[PDB]
Amino acid sequence: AAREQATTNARILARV
Amino acid sequence: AAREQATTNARILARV
Amino acid sequence: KIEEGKLVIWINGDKGYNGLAEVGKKFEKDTGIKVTVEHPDKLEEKFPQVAATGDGPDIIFWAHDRFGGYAQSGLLAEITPDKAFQDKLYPFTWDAVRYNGKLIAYPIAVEALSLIYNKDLLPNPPKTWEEIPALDKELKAKGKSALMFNLQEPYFTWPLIAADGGYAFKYENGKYDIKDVGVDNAGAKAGLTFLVDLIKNKHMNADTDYSIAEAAFNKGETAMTINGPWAWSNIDTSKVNYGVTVLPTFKGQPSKPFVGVLSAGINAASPNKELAKEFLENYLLTDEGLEAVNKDKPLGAVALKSYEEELAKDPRIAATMENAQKGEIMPNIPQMSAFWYAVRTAVINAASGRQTVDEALKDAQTNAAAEFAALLHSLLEANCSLALAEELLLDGYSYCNTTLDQIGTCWPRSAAGALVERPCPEYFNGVKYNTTRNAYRECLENGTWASKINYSQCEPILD
Amino acid sequence: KIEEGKLVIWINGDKGYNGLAEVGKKFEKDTGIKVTVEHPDKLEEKFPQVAATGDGPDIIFWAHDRFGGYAQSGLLAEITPDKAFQDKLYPFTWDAVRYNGKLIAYPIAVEALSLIYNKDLLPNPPKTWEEIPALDKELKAKGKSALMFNLQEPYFTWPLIAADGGYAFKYENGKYDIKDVGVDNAGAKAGLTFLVDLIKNKHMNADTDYSIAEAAFNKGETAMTINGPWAWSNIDTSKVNYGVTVLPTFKGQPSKPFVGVLSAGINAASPNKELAKEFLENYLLTDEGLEAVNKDKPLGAVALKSYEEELAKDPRIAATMENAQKGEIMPNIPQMSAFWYAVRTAVINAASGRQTVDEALKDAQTNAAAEFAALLHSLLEANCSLALAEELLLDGYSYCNTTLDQIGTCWPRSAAGALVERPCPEYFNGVKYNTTRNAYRECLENGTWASKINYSQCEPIL
Amino acid sequence: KIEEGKLVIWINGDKGYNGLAEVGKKFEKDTGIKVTVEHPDKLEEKFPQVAATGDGPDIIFWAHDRFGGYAQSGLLAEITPDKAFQDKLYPFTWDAVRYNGKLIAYPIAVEALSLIYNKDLLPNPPKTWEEIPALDKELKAKGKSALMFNLQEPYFTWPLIAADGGYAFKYENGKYDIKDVGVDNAGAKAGLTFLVDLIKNKHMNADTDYSIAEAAFNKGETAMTINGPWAWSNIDTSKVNYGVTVLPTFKGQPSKPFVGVLSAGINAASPNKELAKEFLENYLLTDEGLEAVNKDKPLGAVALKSYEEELAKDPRIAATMENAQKGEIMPNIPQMSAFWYAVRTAVINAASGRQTVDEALKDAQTNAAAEFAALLHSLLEANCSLALAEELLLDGWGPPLDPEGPYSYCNTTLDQIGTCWPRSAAGALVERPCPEYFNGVKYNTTRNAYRECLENGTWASKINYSQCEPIL
Amino acid sequence: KIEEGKLVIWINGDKGYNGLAEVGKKFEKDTGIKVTVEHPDKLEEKFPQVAATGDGPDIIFWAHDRFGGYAQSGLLAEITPDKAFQDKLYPFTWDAVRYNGKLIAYPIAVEALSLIYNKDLLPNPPKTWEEIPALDKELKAKGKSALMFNLQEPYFTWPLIAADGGYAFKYENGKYDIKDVGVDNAGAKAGLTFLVDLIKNKHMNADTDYSIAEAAFNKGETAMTINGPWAWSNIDTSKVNYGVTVLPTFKGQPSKPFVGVLSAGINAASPNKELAKEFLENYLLTDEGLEAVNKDKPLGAVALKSYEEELAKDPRIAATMENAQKGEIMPNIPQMSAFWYAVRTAVINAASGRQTVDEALKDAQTNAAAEFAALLHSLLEANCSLALAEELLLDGWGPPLDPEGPYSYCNTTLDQIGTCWPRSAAGALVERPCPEYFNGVKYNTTRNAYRECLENGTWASKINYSQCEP
């Protein structure tokens, strides 16, 4: 999903 | 397209 | 090697070639010059293959859209009709054969697709694409069907794809913008989705091609077909009571057929250019010349003023022109080749279910706009400028300056009098080349690049 | 929000979850701590979705391959077993749950696919994939078929794609090379072509999935299937006289199943980490713990030394291990996610005839190696170097130097003490963002970039 | 895209363009073909920029030196006058418009700089550059000055730089040796040193440009100027009693002006080539055609035999030709463009004191100014190509775009200032920060430039740079 | 990829590395862990190149100034000594290895330059730089020379450049002001002028480097040298009767050497961090461990309290510490790298007469050397990234590639010399023309460099530049 991929990105962006 | 686009290409490479 | 003292003519097998051979017979009685008329398969593809070698027909017949691509490759001879002959033909038909200001073919006739319908099965043909589904359901119950036309050639479905806003190349400021392709917009999607849905819903079959469609209609098995003026002849023989009318609307918008101009171009390699000019001007573009062809297979709206004034009466010709007016004359640019092949693929793939409509038309956009090449090009442009930057930086009188030729080789800054070698490009026009071979270009003693670049050593990589 | 004072456990519906709930029942008697076992659909995809928000199970069960991607996203708690507990399990099972030197899950059992065959229909199962066509012809004449297995999950056809040289990520120098993907080589093409041909020749059906295959086999309708240890239980019930054997060879090469290690990871957001550790170490990883689950659905070769020594006798376990040895342990890297999705698509598309084998596997190659990303990256790298060149040229004392962060933003040369803004990246990990929003990074007073980059304002386009 | 059925003509703003429009007016009466005469700033740099894209004027007017580079780049159409027409013009004027054996333009008139002096302030103009300092001191005491001329265009100081031995490209065996440049020799150094000294000694001002000099001379404030025939018209109006004479010597040697031949070239991309030829041959290159332009601003010694035989009488034309003879016809080779840019920078830098004479001319010899301009430029070119690459990649192979979001964009381009305009939606007004550097000048980057992406998916041709200021 | 279960150690070739290998030999006896001591050329530049890829030594030894940049770049593992261990070493030595409040290396020894002189040729070494010219004239008459020392490393000339007012970064309020650089002030200019003048007047030679100076001093050919404690060992062997004394003053002011603390850092990527710690704490930082290394090449004033109390006696150590006091502990900030590169270029250019003292130091102030290197470098970087782009584009989205070509390639990369190695088939030996420019030196481009793409699709780590000449 483009839903699943966006929220999992949100993690890496909170991280970095 | 494979053999004939190579024919078309040779003409171009000749004039140039 | 074309024969001297005769004329070989190529025209499509759907057109009035026996009529043409009659005009060729009159030419032969008169001049003693044997005229042979042939109709090979895939002639629009064979011509540039064989003509590339100084071979093929003396004259070629096709719709103008391919002729730009031909003239560009230097395959067509420039035609030289006087003022008086130009007045005999409609100005807009000349416009369609003008490439780079040069006239590159003789216009013969204007062709547009129309709705052809069986008056006994359907006395009232639908005004809209949207009624067709329900109409097919009514007819299936009578063991018939509503509509069959060639689904293998993008020419036939185009009118529907264009109806709600799909377009080939955006026209503005007297120029087609080849970076602006309209094959993947909302309109195009809507049009193609309707077609695919007709198929999913079994109102049409994805296998349906020209002969299947023509045979079914002329046998009274299908109520409607989409075809051009050349097809009317066979319907006359079949005795089907047929009408020719305006194409159905889609989303309230008129169907927009790509209008063709049948055209006669002279092979640039032909030793018989005068004979061909004689034949086309004094024999074919006469009322008798045109009438002979039209009586074999109807030409549509002919380019010759004096004969069109007679055909204009025929309500079938009237319908042709109304469909032509709602559509658009085809661009004649070389990129038309790539456009058609991309749309062919999109439609076939979408219809078979190999790809959804969105995937199919995306690829179509990417193909038609040579976007892979634009992207590659700009990389080679970036790289070549970098090569210049490094040179200048390290540097800090008279060289040939860094350039990038139209093949994608970056010629570095070089000394006057140097013969420069670069590896052959890895990719050019959809073909890969052996990069262990070199191209060669001379930097002249006067600090300017030789205009000719030796690319003789660059071989394709093949299977 | 996970509940404090209980344990919620997720495991796959094909595994021994009722056995697990029994171990959970023993835990509850002892500690008074209610243990709930659930089996949601697509759990390996739901977990990272819900865990991302401080929600989901306390413990998660899956093969180790997904766990690297979980640990990377910071969703798994680090596990802390003592020396004595580590000796109780095989070293190679711990290796499979090690990410970045940290242990991120408990190994439970080793799973490999095997050939399962009906001894009454086929007393002598084929030694090679190549005999299967003819074998299917013999059996169609008896109203049966040769072979049915799940064609919807790449896990099952992989053994055959790998047989003649296909591979996921190339291993060498203790590292998986994520730029070297072997999904589109001669071997992979050969393997997938054979599978597609079986289907074209109507020896298999492209629709065939897990339940279709399982039901056909257990009903005596097909002679052979490909499945794991969890499947044997149902065959026992069905009374089919079955064998479990070595997978057939392809072009003389052994089939190479991707070996899994079923593993238990603790949710980083769970407030019940001690309870989970206590459950896994003192209840599940015991002979009684494992036996309870294994008696529901067989685990395969268990990670616990003392219980595996008993299961090792079972020729079905022996077969499992022989197939495991001819295959390869799955990588646990985060890229496994993208690899499986690419291969799923390739196999489905090639099987259905949407794409040829060549087209399908080409697209798989490009997806699995994230080439769109490598290509894009090197453009951003080029561009950021140019921005530096221009600065330096125009220039000709203490700045933060131009860098490119791992998201693809090029931070230009900036003065000490400056808060720098750049537009949000247009593309990141298959997602497009609104570029009219900015990211923010500080250039510290000491001429070094702050390590944290504020990306809080970058929204996806949905 | 040049308009079919009309003629657009570009000529420099200092020449007789209203005269030319009159000839255009006669052409329109006769043929019905509308003739538009324009005079854009920096037209000799604009032409190769716009003509490179099948755009620009039908006919371009400049001195022949720039035409070789134009022809080389394929921007000029080959001209085909018949024998009879060629006999109507002087052979040496055709020589100047010959490139690669092909004729690439029509010669109009020969231009050389001369000394123009005020007869009331100076009855006897100096014979030598060396007497000018003393002469200025005599005149500063009368609230006047000795000499003012354009210090911003190398064309004006060249005669003095060449006098004692400076040269562009060495000519021999019918060829210019592009490896033999005479911009840094003893002679060139001496000439430029004298000029820099006049400035150091406050007999001239480094700032002085074409308007300042012209206004000062025509107002009777300076005794002498250096200019060409086009300048006489405004002096006539100003009623200053002026003479036109031989340029002063330097170290005994004549000043050596670079002689220009004003020429008319046809754009290779023009669809009106026949019309252009008719206009040039049958309307302009006639006594009436030339006289119309000459009465607006004098042309100099015209290329047309029959009309030159009347102008030859004029002692001002006699002076023009004497200076022309002591100078040298300009090369037309493509390298002239880099030569002029190098000498422009050398003169400006030496005059302003940014560099010593030695340093300035050394860089002129190295071609260091052009090379640097070219370094920065190719970085900006590379960068804008990359921006394009990224757009195209994302567009074609990136995740599915917005169904409802727009369809046709203006594509990433770099304008001639160095601003990279990003891919933008049709109808959008796009801002970019003002460039940090342009033509040796730094600007305030916190201000923006503005450009419109038209509704048709093409960029507006005009770019708004009005807000970009230079800060020191 | 560093090997698990052993220790690889990098130290400079001028230090007591055989001493260190003995300590490694004892560690191996006890633990079974093989310890390899290596001494690569330009190790302080090689380490951040190779460590940046999870490669390189387990332990790196250098003076502390380079460690701040390493820790910044994330290449060093934070060290965790306990209270008792920290009490064993001098507090000021721990200060030197502190970066961002974390301890990033183990201090080993304090290093300062001193004047080393030949007692037979000079019984009374000069007190001042100014007397050296006259002194050289007296000695040239005996077929000898006054002074020789390494002119190729800014570390050696710094004491004199700093003497009258030159400084690296201004220190105040507990911080180095990176905006306040004292490389182009009056003092710095005076110092470098004096040095350039010695050369103009033929009392020294621009070419003089570490070997030349050492060999000349140890052979009794020059009366004085400038060097650190590591150099005493070879002098002992050479049997020159030498003294170690205070550096000469300049315009009355003491010479101000930049004091180094030789330090041991653990690679952040090393899988043997515990072994490294054991080795450093329990084997090296002991009287025996230090004594073993010191007996090979003297360390200077060691960081370990108990051993330094024995070395403190030695007047050579006393001189080391006196010079150290008149000097200044080096900053460890990441900008030290650019600072040294700038001062290296300034000294070389001024010494060879390529630039005046004023021009050289102006460029040092401006950081013009490191900026030009960075300009060229980023162009080469951009270019090799583009070549990569093109390969990837063609590979993925280009016409169906060779079904029977090879499958696995070595990818386009740029090595640290600036050569862009193109995409190449596994097993291929690839040629590229020698780079046109490298470190201010031009080469003959018609010769080739060579690199192997290994059968596994990886590049060989070693690149053959042997054929590249100027």
Ligand SMILES: OC[C@H]1O[C@H](O[C@H]2[C@H](O)[C@@H](O)[C@@H](O)O[C@@H]2CO)[C@H](O)[C@@H](O)[C@@H]1O
């Ligand atoms: O289908 C793409 C095709 O369309 C046109 O060809 C037409 C042609 O214009 C008609 O005269 C008739 O023969 O039907 C053809 C459709 O098959 C374009 O002229 C051609 O370029 C293009 O390939």
Ligand SMILES: OC[C@H]1O[C@H](O[C@H]2[C@H](O)[C@@H](O)[C@@H](O)O[C@@H]2CO)[C@H](O)[C@@H](O)[C@@H]1O
């Ligand atoms: O189908 C791709 C899938 O393969 C593996 O999943 C296995 C799992 O390991 C087994 O425990 C069992 O449940 O069968 C699954 C196949 O459905 C990978 O573990 C998984 O990541 C991947 O999606």
Ligand SMILES: OC[C@H]1O[C@H](O[C@H]2[C@H](O)[C@@H](O)[C@@H](O)O[C@@H]2CO)[C@H](O)[C@@H](O)[C@@H]1O
């Ligand atoms: O200053 C360099 C410039 O010199 C010449 O330009 C002259 C032109 O010839 C005259 O017609 C008159 O307009 O003044 C110009 C100087 O402003 C060259 O023709 C030109 O190419 C060159 O750049």
Ligand SMILES: OC[C@H]1O[C@H](O[C@H]2[C@H](O)[C@@H](O)[C@@H](O)O[C@@H]2CO)[C@H](O)[C@@H](O)[C@@H]1O
């Ligand atoms: O020359 C600049 C250089 O000086 C110092 O390096 C010293 C090192 O500290 C000493 O132990 C000895 O080996 O001599 C070296 C000079 O070659 C700095 O520590 C170093 O970072 C700097 O580049």
